[PDB]
Amino acid sequence: EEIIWESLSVDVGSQGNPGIVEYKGVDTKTGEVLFEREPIPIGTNNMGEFLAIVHGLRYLKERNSRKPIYSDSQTAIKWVKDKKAKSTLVRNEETALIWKLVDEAEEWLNTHTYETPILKWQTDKWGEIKADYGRK
RNA sequence: ACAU
DNA sequence: CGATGT
Ligand SMILES: [K+]
Ligand SMILES: [K+]
Ligand SMILES: [K+]
Ligand SMILES: [Mg+2]
Ligand SMILES: [Mg+2]
Numbered sequence A: 001e002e003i004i005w006e007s008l009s010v011d012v013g014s015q016g017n018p019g020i021v022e023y024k025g026v027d028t029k030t031g032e033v034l035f036e037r038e039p040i041p042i043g044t045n046n047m048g049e050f051l052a053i054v055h056g057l058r059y060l061k062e063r064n065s066r067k068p069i070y071s072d073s074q075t076a077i078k079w080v081k082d083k084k085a086k087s088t089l090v091r092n093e094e095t096a097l098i099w100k101l102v103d104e105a106e107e108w109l110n111t112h113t114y115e116t117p118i119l120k121w122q123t124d125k126w127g128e129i130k131a132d133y134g135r136k
Numbered sequence B: 001a002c003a004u
Numbered sequence C: 001c002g003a004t005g006t
Helices: A045-062 A074-082 A096-109
Strands: A008-016 A019-027 A033-036 A040-043 A069-071 A118-120
Touching (some): A045 A096
Parallel strands (some): A008 A069
Antiparallel strands (some): A019 A033
């Protein structure tokens, strides 16, 4: 502890897993929604959590912001660190769109630099991350 | 077991 | 109850 309030918080929302995936980023202090991705018809929770972090990195870099990013996803934080999303989701026609976005997110990571700290939101201590969809 |  | 991941 404690919370770094000067930060961006991201989270995925889904209908089914695998299922319809969306994500959003919010100002941790105020909850102001800063970006929201259009729903993707089929994806996994972890793909969406991964895309949300990468989008946050791109959003902050474009704005010359040094704020950290909070995510509640152990998996996606590691995938971003590794620059490699190790998803089990079948690559087929139904999943082509999500897999294109994930491939493109990995590609951006491998062609850009950033100093943004990517931090674990401590749900057990602090409650739900501020970007949560409130579906559970 | 942990995190979603 | 189920699924995605380390
Ligand atoms: K939720
Ligand atoms: K959670
Ligand atoms: K499990
Ligand atoms: Mg989450
Ligand atoms: Mg959530």
